Structure formats: C-alpha cells, structure tokens
Amino acid sequence: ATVSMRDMLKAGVHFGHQTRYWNPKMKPFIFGARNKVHIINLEKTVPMFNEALAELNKIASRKGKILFVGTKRAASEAVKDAALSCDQFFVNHRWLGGMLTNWKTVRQSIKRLKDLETQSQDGTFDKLTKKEALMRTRELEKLENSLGGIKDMGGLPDALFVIDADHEHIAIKEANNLGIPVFAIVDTNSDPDGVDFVIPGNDDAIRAVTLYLGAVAATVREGRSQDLASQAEESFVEAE
Amino acid sequence: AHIEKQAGELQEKLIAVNRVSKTVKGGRIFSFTALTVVGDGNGRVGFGYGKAREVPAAIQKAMEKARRNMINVALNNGTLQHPVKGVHTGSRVFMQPASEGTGIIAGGAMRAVLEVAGVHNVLAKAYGSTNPINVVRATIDGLENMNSPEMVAAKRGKSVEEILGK
Amino acid sequence: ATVNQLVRKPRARKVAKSNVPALEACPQKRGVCTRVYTTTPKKPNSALRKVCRVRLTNGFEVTSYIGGEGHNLQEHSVILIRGGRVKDLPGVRYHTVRGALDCSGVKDRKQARSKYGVKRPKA
Amino acid sequence: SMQDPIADMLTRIRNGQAANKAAVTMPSSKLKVAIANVLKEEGFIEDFKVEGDTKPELELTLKYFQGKAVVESIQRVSRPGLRIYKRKDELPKVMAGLGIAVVSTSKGVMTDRAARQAGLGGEIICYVA
Amino acid sequence: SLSTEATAKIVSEFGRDANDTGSTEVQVALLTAQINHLQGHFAEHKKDHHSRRGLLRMVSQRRKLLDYLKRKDVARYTRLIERLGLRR
RNA sequence: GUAAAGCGCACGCAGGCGGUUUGUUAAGUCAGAUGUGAAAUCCCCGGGCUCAACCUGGGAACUGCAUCUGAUACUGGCAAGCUUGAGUCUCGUAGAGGGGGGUAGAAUUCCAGGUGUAGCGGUGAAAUGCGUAGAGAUCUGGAGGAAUACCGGUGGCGAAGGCGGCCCCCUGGACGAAGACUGACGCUCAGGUGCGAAAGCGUGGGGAGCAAACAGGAUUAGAUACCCUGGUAGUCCACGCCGUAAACGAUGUCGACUUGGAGGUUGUGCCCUUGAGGCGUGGCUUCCGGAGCUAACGCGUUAAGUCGACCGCCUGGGGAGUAC
Incomplete structure (x- = not known):
C-alpha cells in the first residue's frame, strides 16, 4: 500500500543506535556510521515495505485469524492495541x-x-x-x-506477525515447516535472512516500534472488513 | 503433504531397521530406529529417518519425515538429462545421461530403490562410504539441479530460462 | 596433484593380494612332511588341533591343517597340500587334501565327498 | 602471476552468480569476446558491453531464472599446459545437449552444435553443468 | 640505501642521457651500486647471514634484467657487462 | 590442518607454463585429400552339418601407421609496443630482522672488617647437605659472571622455525606518499648454493647461579621412575663441525576473485579532529558470521571458498627413520 512511504520517514528519525555493533547480513540497508552510532538507510527500505503491504491486503480475504510473535517489553503495548479482540492472537511471555x-x-x-x-x-x-x-x-x-494471549485460538493461523527476530527464531522456523507466510519487522542486529517480506527497522524509540506495526496492522484488518461487506451484498441483492 | 509431489498411494520403501542402546543408567533401551524413503515414480527428494519404542511407531514417524517439506522433482518417468556430481557426507556418486535399453545391475535392495526413483539408467557404482544410510543418496544430491527435456527446442532450452530472468 | 607432476613422478598403489606362499602361481603344491604337531590355538580358546609342517618342493617350509577325526598322516611322507588360511592357529596358510597321496578320508564324514576326500562315505 | 585468464574469467562469473551480483567486470580479449558472443546467444550470459579506448575491458551480466543460480559451475577443460582437442566425429555431449561445450575451430568460436554442422573439430574451451 | 650524490652520477653515466632510473641499463647500474655498498658491510660481519639473504635478492634480479637486455639489444648488453666489470 | 601425507626456509638454473595488441610464421592443432590395414574361430550381415558346438564368403574393431595441401579460433616461435603483471630513483613511517663495539645497578654468591648467637636448608612429612674454625641474617665497602623482569599489548618484526637490557657503528627486509621511468623484463621450481629453536661440539677466554651423570638422602610389595640435598660437563662469549626437531597456519609458493561489520593499531587526506572515535585510502592484526567446503572440530575476504599455474608429499597396521 501507498501508506509505507509516508510511514517510514515519520517514524525513522530516531535512526536507532545499538552502538557501532549492528549486523553485517542487514548491511545494505544500514547507512555508514556517524561517530560510533549506527544510522539506518530510510530510502532503500521503501520498496521492501510497500511490497509487504500489498501482500497483506491479498491475505485479508484469505484470513479469519492473525498470530503476533516476537513481542518484547518496549513493544507489548503496540501488539495489544493492534489485536483489539479475540480474533487476533499474540505471544509475549516467550515462545x-x-x-x-x-x-x-x-x-x-x-x-x-x-x-x-x-x-x-x-x-x-x-x-x-x-x-x-x-x-x-x-x-x-x-x-x-x-x-494467555493464544488461549482462544480456534485453529492454525494463515499468517505470522513478527516485530523482532532477535529472540524468536523458532517460531519462524516452524511457521516455514507449516507453510505460513511471515510478515516481518526486523531491527538492526536482526538479519533480513529467512522471512518472506521485511521492513528494516531499529529496536529503540517507542514511537517507531508503534508506527511500523500501525501500518502493517491497517492493511489486513480493513482489508478483511471490505471482503466481509462484499460477502453480505451477494445474498442480500436476491431477496429485495 | 505441504509441497510434496502428486503422489497417490504411499511408498513404503523401508530401507533399514536397527536398534540402539547405551544401557548406562537403568537397563537397556527397547526403542527402535528406522530409515525410510517415500517417492512417486517420477522423481522425489523424499527421505525420512525416524524412531519410536517398537517398530510400527518407528516406521510411521520415519515416513512422515520422508514426506513433509519435500520439493517436486521434474524428471520424465525413466529418462533424466542433467544429473549432479552427487556428494553426501563422504558418500559420493557420479551418474551421467544414458539409454534405458542397456539395463541396470545394482546389489542388495538397491536395483529396487533405483527403479522407484526414476534414476536407474543414469546410475553408476558408488564410491566413498558404502554405509547403508548414505549409499542410497543417488536420487537426492544427484538431482538437486536437473532438467529432462522432451522438446524439439532442446538447443534453445538454456536460452528459455535466461529470458525469464530478464 | 598436477598432470605434469604425474609425468615427472608416477602413481603407486596399495600392496597386492597374497596369503599362500606356494610359488609357480598355483593353488596346490606337493612336499615331504618334516614334523607333526599337537598344537594350541591363538585367539582365546582351548583345543588340540592337528597341524603338519611340510617341506615343499621349492625348499621353503609351511604349516598345513589336518582336518577331521581319524588320523593317517605319517611324519616323513609325500602329500599334496592346498592353500586356505586358518585363523584359529598362528600363520596356518594351508589345508591337506585328504583324498590325495598318502592321506586317507575322515571317519564319519558324509558332509562332503570331495571336500575332506572320502570315497563313497559312511554314516 | 597471471597464467590462465579464461579460468579466472569463469571464477569471476562463478562467485558472481553464487554471491547474487548482477554484473561482473574483468580485462577483455579477442578470445573473451569470441566466447561471450556464444554465451550471449545460448543465454549463459544475458548481454555484455566491451569498453576501454586504451585497452579493451569486458562487463557482462549473469545467468539467472528467479535471481539465484541455474548453471552450477562453468569450468575450462582445455587450458594452459593441458590442451585437449576434439575431432569432427568426437565432439562432446554436456548434459545431453541441453548444455554446451564452447569449441574454438580454425574458422572461429562457436558451439558444439555449429562445430558439428560445419564438419570441424578443434580446441574444447569450457563445459557447463 | 645508497648516497644521493652517487645515485645522481650513476644516472648521469648509465641508461640513456634522459637521467631516468627505470630502463634496464640504469636499473643494473643502480642494483650494482647497492650490491657494492652491501659488499662494503661484508668486508667484516662474516656471521651476518640474515642480510646476505637480501644480497641474493638484489643479485638474482640483476641476472634476470641481464637476460632481458640480451633477449633485446646486444650493443647495450656487451657494453653494460664490460662497463660494470661483471663476471670473469 | 588433524585419519598415511606441504618440502625447514629463502633465492633460482634445467623442465613446464605464459596478461594483452599489431606484425608474421606455422611446431602442435583441426578440416580437406590420398594410401595402408588378408582370414574367420570374436563382432555384424549372409551360408551349411539333425541344431549347437564347429567351419566359413561379404562387411568390420582389421584393434596399427602416413604425409601433402588449406585454415588461423587456440598454444609454441620471433620483433616492436601496450599496461593490466612485474621492476626502480630520492623521500617519509613502524618494528625485539641480522653482524661487531660500548655500558649501569640489584638479590643469590664471595671476601674483608664491624655487630651478633644457634640453627640454617628442605618438605607431602622427612632425612642427607652446610654450621660454633661462629653459620644463617645484617651494616659498610670491594669482588665477580649470566641476566635485564615491568614498559611487554588481541602490538610489531624476520625467510619458516626464528627475534626482547640500553646505546652507537655497519646494513637488510617491510609499510605508506608525491614527482618520474622502463614496459611481460612474468610464474613455479627437480638438481642446486646460502642460512640452526635447543642442546651435542674442538680450542682459547670465562663461571654468580641453575643442572644430566656421580654420591648420598627419601618414597615403597620394591624404587633406575616419584620427591629432596650436594655437584660436574653445560648454560656465557669468540671462531669452528654434519643444520636436528612438535623447523606452526601441525595449513606449499606467490597471484586473481567472493554480502560484510566491528575490535587492535599505524602511514596519510578530511572532522567542534572531541568517545584508543567518524569518513577517504593503503598497512599489518583479531573477533563475529553469509555464500561455499568439511567426518568432525573448524575455515570464511589474511579460507579450510571459487580458482590460477607449477612443485613437493601420501597410499593398511606392527616390525623401520632401521636395513641397503
């Protein structure tokens, strides 16, 4: 969706930090250090992120249930507000x-x-x-x-919602054995490797871990909504 | 199952069975180990090593691992044109394109595994380790990149694959 | 390594296949007995095995097994021997042809005829 | 130091396709062009340019189908010190003629199919797998 | 290491009259001139083997640069070899 | 790399190979052309004996060899370039590379005088040794020989093993940088000359401590092993004799290529140089991990990857690095 280009800049100007450590396998989307602080490259990330949102829209009409994993302390409150109700599930007390x-x-x-x-x-x-x-x-x-956040889950999910790969590699590993598409937001120490669509991001700044997730959340949920309303219309036409 | 090929009824190719124990901490282990291959006659990567307390459960675990997260392999029944210099963990194989008019000699159970593999005709004698577990890897690493063209356009065939990358 | 390197110094391989020192590239060979031995096995065992030393026609000397019940050898006779190693005894590379020369077949052999050398065997 | 430059051309392609690079540049030769032309029409490279007014230098674009490799390796067979020559009647078979041997005949560089159509033999440069 | 004032005389006298250091003749004449400096150290120091290793580098390379001129022009060569008094 | 297996290392003749272009030849190369290759028992098409075994015409691997004439895509030759290989000038820079000179203080040790009385030493616990001729330690002053801790660090250097007090004389090899030159002068290396961690070693010089042997103590089912005290050649220099090895990356030489970040630390351009920092570009050095490779550990841009030429070396164990 068109939402990804506006979203990336507005969030990103914390630039992360994570000292000068960072991860070499993410390196093309990492712009060169300014005195031992890492700086993310925001331009090269827009094709990746727009790509992700179009696939989210196409699964909307495919899904009844989303599973949010890779949650952490600084990110939990954004994972809750995107779930809203028990048709959207999440894990936050470790996988x-x-x-x-x-x-x-x-x-x-x-x-x-x-x-x-x-x-x-x-x-x-x-x-x-x-x-x-x-x-x-x-x-x-x-x-x-x-x-506590998966207790209600009525069946095996259609997609996997990742906000960090840093501690949560296994979930991704099994999701790929189950044949599930992963929609990811990876940080600077994370690798992009091995998941289906990525948003390059950074793990600090509470405003950035929300805005990244806020873009990912809209496309599937108002996507599903529009599929359902189109399902009502098809039978109701007949009887009037 | 998942990505598995257009398989129809089970392949129940049991290759081996064994039984293993340390016996160090509380009498022996009773559980058994199984090695099983599940293909389809047209060429598959299906190979499953599994284990359980008694043989019937050991094979059914092994047969699941023989069939899940396995890619289709597109050879034409009994002809294959483009093998690989097959290596798996020191057990090394080196098939090359060949007529089926010539027959197959292969020892033990192996002429039987190869005829269900679709790879019997290109096949040549193993070298490196002649251990039961790794000697059968003919149809896995030896097909890992392959084609099997029937087309009159065989000499345009690599051209056709570039202009899809364009 | 390199092919020029193979023109400059050749291939050489593993040691060739031998365990019968019989000479003249033949499975069986004649000699005169020198000694008869009661002897004991190698590997962990207890038996009284029969071996003869024969002094072969090439003038080397070998030890040959004397199989089955019913002993008939004499310690100065000419016999034919056949290569076939025995792992029970140290360096025993031969068996004796029970149907040949000064040998007589085994009592209560019917298991094989030509093997262990019995003319029209007995139960 | 530089003893076989068409094997060094081929190693630059080989690490090129394994490492997901789009183009690979190296020094050019009349032999290198003459090879690259055959690769270009048999689709083992996509396109190339030759450039440099002082000395010529070659930039070429790699074989793919989805983005990662579909030829595993390309190796020289005739080389520095081990020249191997094939007769008209003995032109080779590489993956049942889905693959090429690039064969330099006295009349130029061509594929095994064209060396056979001419009725020539010559130097067998490199095979695909 | 050789003196600034010898190096400039050697350049004046050897190679062509351009007073370059690169051509094959002036490169034999400069190598010779260090080889000779080092032989001055080897008037004593007869157990100083790790520096002799260095001598054989400069010597070998001159051997190569003499083959090269003699593969090329013979006038320059027959002059040079007699002009530095090399060999017997 | 470790299973058997990288030469101990530099440098390099013979041999083998040769970035890139024009001129040119045609050794090897390939096409063309012509001649040779008896016969079946083998192989293929025929044929015959009751089939078959067996025998055989015609075709054939006839299992073997030939040269002229054409070609120049490739290699070999040769001349002159090119730089894209490599070589060289003065300058700066970092370091325990090598040979010979010079030099100081401090404990053991020793001597002399002064002061002073009984253990000192050794250990698991112990006894041999040494000591009342006055030891041990201690004050003052002298003596003598190796050594020179720290700084010494994931540092740096040497050809590999290899290099450490501090200074000078003599000099190598390596790292950068600006002006400037030549222009494959290249690569590897059988034979080859040259070169030792350590001790072994001939004589002179030298000896404070440490030490194989040799004595004696102690250990114990005995005890040459284990553990202790005395104590010599050695260790230390100079020159001289075959260079051994666990002579290292347990990793051949040197060269090309392959997503990288970051540590240690240095030449130099640029920075409020403001964080042993950042960026531009070389330098050695090290953690981390992708592609790839491995039995496994592991290697990974300084490979153990993709490779390059050329070389060394291994082919079951014991018995043998001995025999010859």
Whole structure:
C-alpha cells in the first residue's frame, strides 16, 4: 500500500543506535556510521515495505485469524492495541517448543486451561483445604502465564506477525515447516535472512516500534472488513 | 503433504531397521530406529529417518519425515538429462545421461530403490562410504539441479530460462 | 596433484593380494612332511588341533591343517597340500587334501565327498 | 602471476552468480569476446558491453531464472599446459545437449552444435553443468 | 640505501642521457651500486647471514634484467657487462 | 590442518607454463585429400552339418601407421609496443630482522672488617647437605659472571622455525606518499648454493647461579621412575663441525576473485579532529558470521571458498627413520 512511504520517514528519525555493533547480513540497508552510532538507510527500505503491504491486503480475504510473535517489553503495548479482540492472537511471555508443529499438545493444554478457568470462576474447587485449591491454582497460573494471549485460538493461523527476530527464531522456523507466510519487522542486529517480506527497522524509540506495526496492522484488518461487506451484498441483492 | 509431489498411494520403501542402546543408567533401551524413503515414480527428494519404542511407531514417524517439506522433482518417468556430481557426507556418486535399453545391475535392495526413483539408467557404482544410510543418496544430491527435456527446442532450452530472468 | 607432476613422478598403489606362499602361481603344491604337531590355538580358546609342517618342493617350509577325526598322516611322507588360511592357529596358510597321496578320508564324514576326500562315505 | 585468464574469467562469473551480483567486470580479449558472443546467444550470459579506448575491458551480466543460480559451475577443460582437442566425429555431449561445450575451430568460436554442422573439430574451451 | 650524490652520477653515466632510473641499463647500474655498498658491510660481519639473504635478492634480479637486455639489444648488453666489470 | 601425507626456509638454473595488441610464421592443432590395414574361430550381415558346438564368403574393431595441401579460433616461435603483471630513483613511517663495539645497578654468591648467637636448608612429612674454625641474617665497602623482569599489548618484526637490557657503528627486509621511468623484463621450481629453536661440539677466554651423570638422602610389595640435598660437563662469549626437531597456519609458493561489520593499531587526506572515535585510502592484526567446503572440530575476504599455474608429499597396521 501507498501508506509505507509516508510511514517510514515519520517514524525513522530516531535512526536507532545499538552502538557501532549492528549486523553485517542487514548491511545494505544500514547507512555508514556517524561517530560510533549506527544510522539506518530510510530510502532503500521503501520498496521492501510497500511490497509487504500489498501482500497483506491479498491475505485479508484469505484470513479469519492473525498470530503476533516476537513481542518484547518496549513493544507489548503496540501488539495489544493492534489485536483489539479475540480474533487476533499474540505471544509475549516467550515462545514454547512446538506451538505450531505440536499444536496438538498445545491446544490440549489450552483446553485444560479454559476448562479449569471456567471451573475456578463458577467456584467448584475453592471448598476444603487450601492445599486442594492451591495445587490446582498453581497449575492454572503456569498455563495462564504461558498461554494467555493464544488461549482462544480456534485453529492454525494463515499468517505470522513478527516485530523482532532477535529472540524468536523458532517460531519462524516452524511457521516455514507449516507453510505460513511471515510478515516481518526486523531491527538492526536482526538479519533480513529467512522471512518472506521485511521492513528494516531499529529496536529503540517507542514511537517507531508503534508506527511500523500501525501500518502493517491497517492493511489486513480493513482489508478483511471490505471482503466481509462484499460477502453480505451477494445474498442480500436476491431477496429485495 | 505441504509441497510434496502428486503422489497417490504411499511408498513404503523401508530401507533399514536397527536398534540402539547405551544401557548406562537403568537397563537397556527397547526403542527402535528406522530409515525410510517415500517417492512417486517420477522423481522425489523424499527421505525420512525416524524412531519410536517398537517398530510400527518407528516406521510411521520415519515416513512422515520422508514426506513433509519435500520439493517436486521434474524428471520424465525413466529418462533424466542433467544429473549432479552427487556428494553426501563422504558418500559420493557420479551418474551421467544414458539409454534405458542397456539395463541396470545394482546389489542388495538397491536395483529396487533405483527403479522407484526414476534414476536407474543414469546410475553408476558408488564410491566413498558404502554405509547403508548414505549409499542410497543417488536420487537426492544427484538431482538437486536437473532438467529432462522432451522438446524439439532442446538447443534453445538454456536460452528459455535466461529470458525469464530478464 | 598436477598432470605434469604425474609425468615427472608416477602413481603407486596399495600392496597386492597374497596369503599362500606356494610359488609357480598355483593353488596346490606337493612336499615331504618334516614334523607333526599337537598344537594350541591363538585367539582365546582351548583345543588340540592337528597341524603338519611340510617341506615343499621349492625348499621353503609351511604349516598345513589336518582336518577331521581319524588320523593317517605319517611324519616323513609325500602329500599334496592346498592353500586356505586358518585363523584359529598362528600363520596356518594351508589345508591337506585328504583324498590325495598318502592321506586317507575322515571317519564319519558324509558332509562332503570331495571336500575332506572320502570315497563313497559312511554314516 | 597471471597464467590462465579464461579460468579466472569463469571464477569471476562463478562467485558472481553464487554471491547474487548482477554484473561482473574483468580485462577483455579477442578470445573473451569470441566466447561471450556464444554465451550471449545460448543465454549463459544475458548481454555484455566491451569498453576501454586504451585497452579493451569486458562487463557482462549473469545467468539467472528467479535471481539465484541455474548453471552450477562453468569450468575450462582445455587450458594452459593441458590442451585437449576434439575431432569432427568426437565432439562432446554436456548434459545431453541441453548444455554446451564452447569449441574454438580454425574458422572461429562457436558451439558444439555449429562445430558439428560445419564438419570441424578443434580446441574444447569450457563445459557447463 | 645508497648516497644521493652517487645515485645522481650513476644516472648521469648509465641508461640513456634522459637521467631516468627505470630502463634496464640504469636499473643494473643502480642494483650494482647497492650490491657494492652491501659488499662494503661484508668486508667484516662474516656471521651476518640474515642480510646476505637480501644480497641474493638484489643479485638474482640483476641476472634476470641481464637476460632481458640480451633477449633485446646486444650493443647495450656487451657494453653494460664490460662497463660494470661483471663476471670473469 | 588433524585419519598415511606441504618440502625447514629463502633465492633460482634445467623442465613446464605464459596478461594483452599489431606484425608474421606455422611446431602442435583441426578440416580437406590420398594410401595402408588378408582370414574367420570374436563382432555384424549372409551360408551349411539333425541344431549347437564347429567351419566359413561379404562387411568390420582389421584393434596399427602416413604425409601433402588449406585454415588461423587456440598454444609454441620471433620483433616492436601496450599496461593490466612485474621492476626502480630520492623521500617519509613502524618494528625485539641480522653482524661487531660500548655500558649501569640489584638479590643469590664471595671476601674483608664491624655487630651478633644457634640453627640454617628442605618438605607431602622427612632425612642427607652446610654450621660454633661462629653459620644463617645484617651494616659498610670491594669482588665477580649470566641476566635485564615491568614498559611487554588481541602490538610489531624476520625467510619458516626464528627475534626482547640500553646505546652507537655497519646494513637488510617491510609499510605508506608525491614527482618520474622502463614496459611481460612474468610464474613455479627437480638438481642446486646460502642460512640452526635447543642442546651435542674442538680450542682459547670465562663461571654468580641453575643442572644430566656421580654420591648420598627419601618414597615403597620394591624404587633406575616419584620427591629432596650436594655437584660436574653445560648454560656465557669468540671462531669452528654434519643444520636436528612438535623447523606452526601441525595449513606449499606467490597471484586473481567472493554480502560484510566491528575490535587492535599505524602511514596519510578530511572532522567542534572531541568517545584508543567518524569518513577517504593503503598497512599489518583479531573477533563475529553469509555464500561455499568439511567426518568432525573448524575455515570464511589474511579460507579450510571459487580458482590460477607449477612443485613437493601420501597410499593398511606392527616390525623401520632401521636395513641397503
């Protein structure tokens, strides 16, 4: 979409920093240092980013469910406001081994989480000794903390929403085995390598990790909306 | 499954079975190991090494790994024109284009694996390690870049691939 | 390395295939017995095996196995021997043709006829 | 130092296509042009220019189909010190004639198909895989 | 290392009259002139082997530059070789 | 690289090879042309004996060799360029490269005098040694020989192993930079001359400490190994004798190419030079990782990649680096 060219400049003038360390495999989109601070190249990034948004629009009519991974402290609040409701899922308490490949065990442990959470809230195990409630309380806590932003997920997702590759390589690894397209925002120490569409970015400046994500979020969500309204119209024409 | 070729009913090419144990910490290990190849007669990369506590579960794990994240390979049944100087972990093969009128000699189970591979006619004797696991790599690394043209335009064939890169 | 390098100094290969020192490129050979031996195995074992030393016609000397029950060798006779190594005993490179020269076939052999040298065997 | 310059041409293409470069430049020769022409029409390079008023110098554009390599390697067979010559009746077969040997005959540089159509033999420069 | 004032006399006397340092004749005459300077050190210092390594570089290279002139013009060569008193 | 296997290294004749262009030839090259190659038992097309074995006409690998005539795309020759290989002048710069000179203080050690009394030493614990002739240590002053810590750092240098007190004489090799020149004068290297980490080593010089042996102690189922005390050649210089090796990248020589960032640190252009910093361009040096390669570790722009020419070297173990 046309949104990517306006979005990149407005966000980017923090320039990142990350000392002079940076990552050589991202280097073409990294402009040369000014006294041991890294500076991003904002011009070469606009073809990549416009490319990403057109593919997002085409999946809109394809998806009911999005999965946001690669979340971190400085980024969490932007990942929440893009999800809005339980048709858009996210992981922020670290990824678990097999969340896509062993969805079979993962969905089983989610079904035990929503069964014992609805048991807790009616009040059913809270009678007797504190030991008998607390051993259920602790196991529910571990499932709730591990699952909390994916607990509702009605099936294997159509896409993968990445805000960092820095700690989250596995999610991407399995998403590629599952045959899922990744739509990425990578930082300066990240590599561009190995995911389907990239936005080159930097991990600092809370205004930049929001604006980057804000552009990615609009295209799929108002995209889906427009597909649904076109679905209503096709039957309603007949009966009037 | 996923990117897998237009396969029809299962290939159940069991190549090997073994059983492994340290026995160091609590009696022996009972679990078994399996090596299995799943193709389609037209040329595939499907090769799966898997394991479980008893043989039936060992093969079914191994057969999944033989069939998921495997690219189509486009040879024409029994003719192939463009092999590779095949190397896998010291086990080395070097097929070249050839008539099927001439026949195939190959030892053990191997003339049988090669006839389901579609690569029997180009094939020539292995060299490097003659270990059961790596001797069968004829149809994987030896086809990793390939074509098999039937077209009268065979002499324009590399031209046709450049003007798509243009 | 280089091909010119191969014109300047040739290829040379692994050691050729031998374990029978019989001379004249032949599987069987004659000699006169010098000694008969009761002897004990190599590898971890206990037996009383039969070997003869024969002094072959080339004047070298070899040790040959005397297989099956029922001993008939004499320690100064002319016999034919056939190469075929024995791993049970150290440096034993031969077996003796039980049907040849001064040899007689094994008692309670019917397993093979020509092999271990029995004319119309007994049970 | 410089002992075979058409193998050094070929190594510059070879690392060129593996390293995702669009064009590869080196010193030019009458032999280099004469080769490049055959590659250009058989699509093993896309196009080239020859440029330099002092001494000629060659810039060429690589073989691709999607953006990464579809010829694995190109190697010289006749070389400095190991010249190999083929007769009219003995012109070679490279990946069943989907691939080329570039063959310098007395009448010029051409492909194995044209050396055979002429009824010449000559020097076998390089094969594809 | 050779003196500024010898190097300028050598250039005046050897190669062509342009007073260049590059042509084959003036390059033998300059190499000779350092070789000779170094042989002045080797009037003593007979256990100083690591610098003798250096001598053989300059010497070998002169051997090569003599072959080259003699592959080219013989007048320059028969003059030069007699003109620096080289060999027997 | 380590499984067997890079020459110990520089330099280099013979041999082998040769960036790039014009002139020109035609050794090798290739096409053309002509002649040779008996016969089946083999191979192919025929034929015959009850098939087949067997035998055979015609065709053929007839398993082998030939030269003239044409070509100049390639290599070989040769002349003159070109620079794109390499070579050279004065200048600056960094460093433990080499040979010979000069020089100081400090502990052990020693001697003399002064002061002064009983252990000193050694260790796992121990005893041999040394000592009342006065030791050990300590004050003053002298003596003598190697060595010269730190600075010494992921630094720098040498041909590889190799190089470290400080200075000078004599001089190499390497790193940059401006003016200027020649113009393949190139590459590698069998044989080759030249050159030692260390000790071994002939004589002179020299000896403070340390030490194989040799004595004696201690250890222990014995103890030449283990562990201790005495103690000599050596170590130290000068010249001289075969250069051994774990002689390193356990990685051949030197050259071309391949996404890079950053550390250490230096020539030099540019910076409030403002962060051992940034950028332009060489320099050695090192972490990190892509393409590629590996059995594996690992290598990765200083390769262990893609390669280049030419060379060295390996081909199962023991027995043998010995025998000859």
